[PDB]
Design a binder for this molecule. Structure first.
Ligand SMILES: CCCCCCCC/C=C\CCCCCCCC(=O)OC[C@H](COP(=O)(O)OCCN)OC(=O)CCCCCCC/C=C\CCCCCCCC
Ligand SMILES: CCCCCCCC/C=C\CCCCCCCC(=O)OC[C@H](COP(=O)(O)OCCN)OC(=O)CCCCCCC/C=C\CCCCCCCC
Ligand SMILES: NC(=O)C1=CN([C@@H]2O[C@H](COP(=O)(O)OP(=O)(O)OC[C@H]3O[C@@H](n4cnc5c(N)ncnc54)[C@H](OP(=O)(O)O)[C@@H]3O)[C@@H](O)[C@H]2O)C=CC1
Ligand SMILES: *P(=O)(O)OCC(C)(C)[C@H](O)C(=O)NCCC(=O)NCCSC(=O)CCCCCCCCCCCCC
Ligand code: SF4
Ligand code: SF4
Ligand code: SF4
Lengths: 77, 114, 341, 208, 176, 156
């Protein structure tokens, strides 16, 4: 899980709008980071390209936090 | 009641359709740049897609949202099949339009425009 | 202003901008871009041509009906100059060739013709004169091109005190000499450079930026008798610039140092062509010369134009020089070249 | 013998009236009105959702074999609430007759596609969409047919200007055709032609 | 009544079978086509020697426009704008004012020959036979601007073609 | 002088070949194209003058823009014109190609092919008769006759 979290944090830090300083594993995209739905969709697409699998729209709604993202990724192995 | 909806009924499913269309467009800008030999960047294309999506952010009627996503999907399928040329894709960018000022003083200077 | 010169419309193709401009030497790179911009504004344009009328066909679609008028003129004919500048309130001077012909030399095309145009323009009472010079216009430059450029600039300033003298650094574009000259050295095996090109610094300027600066200079009220230096945003060493050009063109890059006297001899050999030479001794001198820094002169940012970097528009020019293997390659693939700042 | 005036066909008028009564009786759920014009053209006005049942009946019924779809168009009437007026023209070869079916809709309400009844309805409904904006629900391939690629707006709406909003030209700076806002050299001269005197008292609208 | 274009079945007697087989082997219909082409070769061509020979026309032909005059020299147009109102393409622009002698004439009369559809409605709507569609049809140009005629150009055309226009009007006006 | 005489003879020879051999591209959009067929017809045979249709733009010298140039068609016309190699000439035919024609005030019509391509000859009419089109072709030929590329180059 450490590798998954490291990869997810590295991918998130490449996003321009997201500040690496304020980014944290438990930071809410909408609330803590102040983003909207489209930016979350772009992040989910970036994760899809990263870990090489498809995240449906239903599974793309329950990924508002990096902790939730890594938990979902580990869930799908 | 009794009002026929185009698709998706309430607003949440319409937003889901909007997100699906945005994903489809987002995963198409690199292919559009590669195929059409555009001089723009992929990041510029994604920014323009975001801008064209955001210029309808005030719509609150689900039927209008469904019609907008239908037209967007039509335009997306025109681009993938290369039915459009480089001309239309660059028409999306207004690369030759003169900058119309929006300040009152300049508008007064140039002409009688409101 | 006359009643026919009052601006009208929303600045479109069929509008009236109140600008009547005679564009000397409009059958060229900067000439065609400036004429296109004027026609897009919707101005009256007079294009004096001495070549075949076929070579001036591409200028017809650049303006609405009755906006582009073609007249025949001779360089050493003040009567023709007066005929073509009689009814225009703006005169734009872009005449210039990079080589010396049998009839016209650097002295003729850069001193006598610009001075005659300025003198006749003053007689006809034109309101604005724009004259194109070079950034490296030195009175004692190693290049006769730059010597004559400086002499003609002084003569034009003397003849027409209310002139605007533009000094672009180096124009790169689709029909340019710069990028095409550097990228056409694929045929001659390797790329010869003087001292490997480590001593030359250049900051080229975009053709569209130069044209927009010329256009805004006309519309700027307080640029009547000024001097402007049009330069790009980033300064490049010549070696890095050529390396980036070849990287974008996706061609093998084999630079080797060629001594200055040998390069001068090679340029002497290539200027014997009766047609347009591939390169000349003065062209070699201009390539070797670094771009002078003139911070006291105003520029594109002062006129109101943001300089366009080379990396953004380098693929419009160099995509033609690629092969079928690399034709579809994107712009982001090649990293930007190192700068000197 | 009144050579100027066109002759009239009472027999065909009566036949069309009888058939209109017949179809109205057979399909009362959707048929709202039946008219016979003075030049013997049967016309049926139905509810918008009855398109498929009414067309299938008129196509496959033994007494009404309208197997050929003559035309399919729409009329934009801005004053009406349901501005768009979908019109079907049908031809019966067996009985050597024609019929017209008219439904109503607006910009947002979809009309069920009749491609499952007539195959020409594919391109006809594509044209209707491209020209007016009427969306057809179940269509094999719905997209623009006549307008330019990426064209915005529907031209045949009565609120669409004649000259459009944009024009095309070749810009040498970008080495490609560009689209710019319309700017006519000579403005289209609108003519007020209607006379201020009533022409036909037979069509006089009551002052309520 | 109706007829079947292709419903004739072939015969099956031995003579016809042998004839069809000979046609299949020996290309009889191909030789017939060759013979027809050879006959057309040996005929006379129907090509005229333009421009030394001009194709036939009719007095009703509608070509280059013109403005006519009365025999006294006065213009025929009275600025009634019927041609402008009836022009399908709106290629005519007319502006008028009272003349110095009070006559109702035209100050601006413009025809855009690049917008005209050459339909003849202007000459049929003219109540004084002022505007006419003359016989000239060879007036091509190297520039767009010269195809935007005005009053002076149309009067010059009328003066140049007055004789032929008058002859055509005389020959055709009884049918109008 | 001798050089002037030589260049005059050479560029009179070169212009003669282009004048006497014209290969219009097979390109007709609307009703004006029928008059192109009637010019190709035996009555006014254009092959008599050395004018013969060729299909590919690469093997064509003259583009006879005959028809209405719509917005959906303009890019294709520009592309084929660009693909047509130099020297190239353009003959606008009919009112639609000249200006707007009957459809001047329309949302989907380009008013004049000269907005897209440099036009050398304008042939008026709706449609221009076969004689008018032939006269336009002959006028284009005579326009090519007075070109002096070598004479301009010699004095250049
Ligand atoms: C066999 C290959 C060797 C023969 C070399 C010549 C190949 C044919 C010439 C050719 O195709 O063009 C070369 C091209 C001609 O240009 P165009 O194609 O006509 O138009 C511009 C296109 N952008 O030549 C040039 O442009 C020369 C420009 C740079 C020349 C600088 C001088 C370099 C001399 C190096 C000599 C080294 C000696 C040691
Ligand atoms: C010196 C040069 C001579 C030039 C001759 C010019 C002939 C006319 C030129 C015009 C012809 C050019 C176009 C021809 C193209 C089409 C020709 C063609 O199709 O022929 C093939 C046609 C069959 O094709 P289809 O009928 O279309 O098959 C499909 C059936 N539904 O017939 C043929 O196969 C031709 C074969 C040649 C016939 C040979 C018959 C001779 C046999 C008898 C010889 C006996 C010798 C031995 C016996 C000795 C006894 C002692
Ligand atoms: N591009 C560059 O490298 C830079 C250029 N400049 C200056 O900008 C100006 C425009 O440059 P550019 O477009 O590249 O040059 P071009 O060679 O492309 O254009 C020169 C123009 O002048 C005409 N001309 C040349 N000689 C004569 C003559 N003897 N008499 C009359 N007309 C003549 C040519 O017409 P024709 O074909 O009929 O002979 C042509 O239209 C020049 O003054 C140049 O010095 C400044 C900085 C950089
Ligand atoms: P989050 O879900 O909180 O926020 C969603 C947004 C911001 C969209 C709004 O909150 C929202 O959903 N608003 C409701 C109104 C609405 O539906 N807006 C979106 C309409 S869909 C739409 O407009 C699609 C248009 C098609 C896109 C055109 C493509 C243009 C790009 C051309 C290519 C150029 C480069 C290749
Ligand atoms: S011939 Fe027809 S289109 Fe031409 S000017 Fe006359 S009325 Fe107008
Ligand atoms: S119809 Fe005849 S008289 Fe009337 S305005 Fe036209 S040309 Fe003049
Ligand atoms: S000018 Fe007339 S004949 Fe020619 S394409 Fe247009 S409508 Fe057809």
């Amino acid at each position: 899980l450490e590798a998954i979290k490291d990869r997810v944090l590295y991918v998130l830090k490449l996003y321009d709008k997201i500040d690496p300083e304020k980014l944290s594993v438990n930071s809410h995209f909408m609330k803590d980071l102040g983003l909207d739905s489209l930016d979350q969709v772009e992040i989910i697409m970036a994760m899809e390209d990263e870990f090489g699998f498809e995240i449906p729209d239903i599974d793309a709604e329950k990924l508002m936090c990096p902790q939730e993202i890594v938990d979902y990724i580990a869930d799908k192995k | 009641t009794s009002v026929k909806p185009i698709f998706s009924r309430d607003m949440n499913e319409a937003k889901r359709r909007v997100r699906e269309l945005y994903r489809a467009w987002y995963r198409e800008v690199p292919n559009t740049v590669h195929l059409f030999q555009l001089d723009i960047s992929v990041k510029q294309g994604r920014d323009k897609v975001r801008e064209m999506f955001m210029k309808n952010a005030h719509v609150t009627d689900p039927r209008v949202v469904d019609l907008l996503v239908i037209k967007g999907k039509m335009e997306l399928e025109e681009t993938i099949n290369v039915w459009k040329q480089r001309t239309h894709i660059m028409r999306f960018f207004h690369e030759t339009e003169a900058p119309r000022p929006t300040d009152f003083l300049s508008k007064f200077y140039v002409g009688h425009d409101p | 202003l006359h009643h026919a010169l009052i601006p009208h419309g929303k600045g479109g193709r069929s509008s009236v901008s109140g600008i009547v401009a005679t564009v000397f030497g409009a059958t060229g790179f900067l000439g065609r871009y400036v004429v296109n911009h004027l026609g897009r504004m919707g101005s009256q344009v007079i294009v004096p041509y001495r070549c075949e009328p076929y070579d001036t066909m591409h200028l017809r679609p650049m303006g609405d009906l009755g906006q582009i008028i073609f007249m025949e003129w001779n360089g050493k004919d003040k009567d023709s100059i007066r005929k073509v500048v009689e009814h225009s309130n703006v005169v734009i001077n872009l005449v210039g060739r990079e080589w010396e012909t049998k009839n016209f030399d650097f002295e003729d095309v850069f001193v006598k013709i610009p001075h005659a145009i300025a003198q006749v323009s003053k007689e006809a009472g034109v309101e604005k004169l724009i004259h194109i010079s070079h950034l490296n216009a030195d009175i004692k430059s190693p290049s006769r091109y730059l010597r004559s450029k400086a002499v003609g600039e002084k003569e034009v300033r003397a003849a027409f005190p209310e002139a605007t003298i533009i000094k672009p650094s180096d124009i790169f574009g689709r029909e340019d000499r710069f990028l095409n000259y550097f990228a056409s050295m694929r045929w001659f095996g390797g790329v010869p450079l003087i001292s490997l090109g480590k001593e030359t610094v250049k900051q080229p300027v975009y053709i569209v930026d130069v044209s927009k600066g010329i256009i805004n200079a006309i519309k700027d009220p307080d640029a009547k008798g000024k001097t402007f230096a049009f330069v790009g945003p980033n300064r490049y060493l010549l070696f890095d610039l050529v390396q980036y050009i070849f990287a974008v063109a996706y061609r093998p890059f084999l630079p080797y140092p060629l001594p200055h006297f040998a390069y001068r001899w090679v340029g002497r050999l290539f200027e014997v062509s009766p047609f347009e030479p591939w390169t000349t001794r003065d062209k070699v001198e201009r390539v070797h010369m670094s771009d002078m820094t003139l911070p006291h002169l105003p520029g594109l940012e002062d006129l109101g134009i943001q300089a366009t970097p080379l990396e953004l528009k380098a693929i419009e020019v160099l995509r033609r020089h690629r092969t079928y293997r690399w034709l579809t390659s994107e712009m982001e693939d090649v990293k930007p070249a190192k700068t000197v700042n | 013998t009144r050579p100027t005036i066109r002759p009239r066909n009472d027999v065909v008028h009566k036949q069309l009236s009888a058939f209109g009564q017949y179809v109205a009786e057979i399909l009362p759920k959707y048929v709202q009105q039946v008219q016979v014009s003075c030049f013997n053209e049967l016309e049926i006005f139905i509810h918008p959702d009855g398109v498929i049942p009414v067309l299938t009946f008129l196509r496959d019924h033994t007494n009404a074999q309208f197997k050929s779809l003559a035309d399919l168009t729409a009329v934009d009437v801005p004053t009406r609430q349901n501005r768009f007026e979908i019109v079907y023209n049908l031809l019966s070869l067996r009985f050597n007759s024609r019929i017209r079916v008219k439904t109503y809709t607006d910009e947002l309400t979809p009309i069920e596609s009749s491609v499952t009844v007539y195959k020409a309805a594919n391109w006809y409904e594509r044209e209707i969409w491209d020209m007016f904006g009427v969306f057809f629900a179940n269509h094999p391939d719905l997209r623009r047919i006549l307008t330019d690629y990426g064209f915005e707006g529907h031209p045949f709406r009565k609120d669409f200007p004649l000259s459009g909003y944009v024009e095309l030209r070749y810009d040498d700076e970008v080495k490609r055709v560009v689209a710019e806002p319309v700017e006519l050299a000579q403005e289209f001269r609108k003519f007020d032609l209607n006379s201020p005197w009533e022409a036909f008292p037979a069509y006089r609208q009551p002052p309520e | 009544t109706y007829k079947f274009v292709n419903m004739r079945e072939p015969s099956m007697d031995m003579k016809s079978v042998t004839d069809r087989a000979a046609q299949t082997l020996l290309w009889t219909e191909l030789v017939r086509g060759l013979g027809m082409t050879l006959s057309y070769l040996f005929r006379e061509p129907a090509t005229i020697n333009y421009p030394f020979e001009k194709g036939p026309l009719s007095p009703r032909f509608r070509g280059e426009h013109a403005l006519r005059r009365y025999p006294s020299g006065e213009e025929r147009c009275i600025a009634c704008k019927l041609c402008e109102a009836v022009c399908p393409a709106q290629a005519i622009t007319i502006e008028a004012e009272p003349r110095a002698d009070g006559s109702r004439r035209t100050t601006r009369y413009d025809i855009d020959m690049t917008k005209c559809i050459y339909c003849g409605f202007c000459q049929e709507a003219c109540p004084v036979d002022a505007i006419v569609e003359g016989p000239n049809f060879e007036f091509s140009t190297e520039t767009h601007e010269e195809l935007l005629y005005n009053k002076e150009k149309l009067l010059n055309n009328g003066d140049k073609w007055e004789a032929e226009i008058a002859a055509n009007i005389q020959a055709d006006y009884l049918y109008r | 002088s001798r050089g002037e005489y030589v260049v005059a003879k050479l560029d009179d020879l070169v212009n003669w070949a282009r004048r006497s051999s014209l290969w219009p591209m097979t390109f007709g959009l609307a009703c004006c194209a029928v008059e192109m067929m009637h010019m190709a017809a035996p009555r006014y045979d254009m092959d008599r003058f050395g004018v013969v249709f060729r299909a590919s733009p690469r093997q064509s010298d003259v583009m006879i823009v005959a028809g209405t140039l719509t917005n959906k068609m303009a890019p294709a016309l520009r592309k084929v014109y660009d693909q047509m190699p130099e020297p190239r000439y353009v003959v606008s035919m009919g009112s639609c190609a000249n200006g707007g024609g009957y459809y001047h005030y329309s949302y989907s019509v380009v008013r004049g092919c000269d907005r897209i391509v440099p036009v050398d000859i304008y042939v008026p009419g709706c449609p221009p008769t076969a004689e008018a089109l032939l006269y336009g072709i002959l006028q284009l030929q005579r326009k090519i006759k007075r070109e002096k590329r070598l004479r301009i180059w010699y004095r250049r």
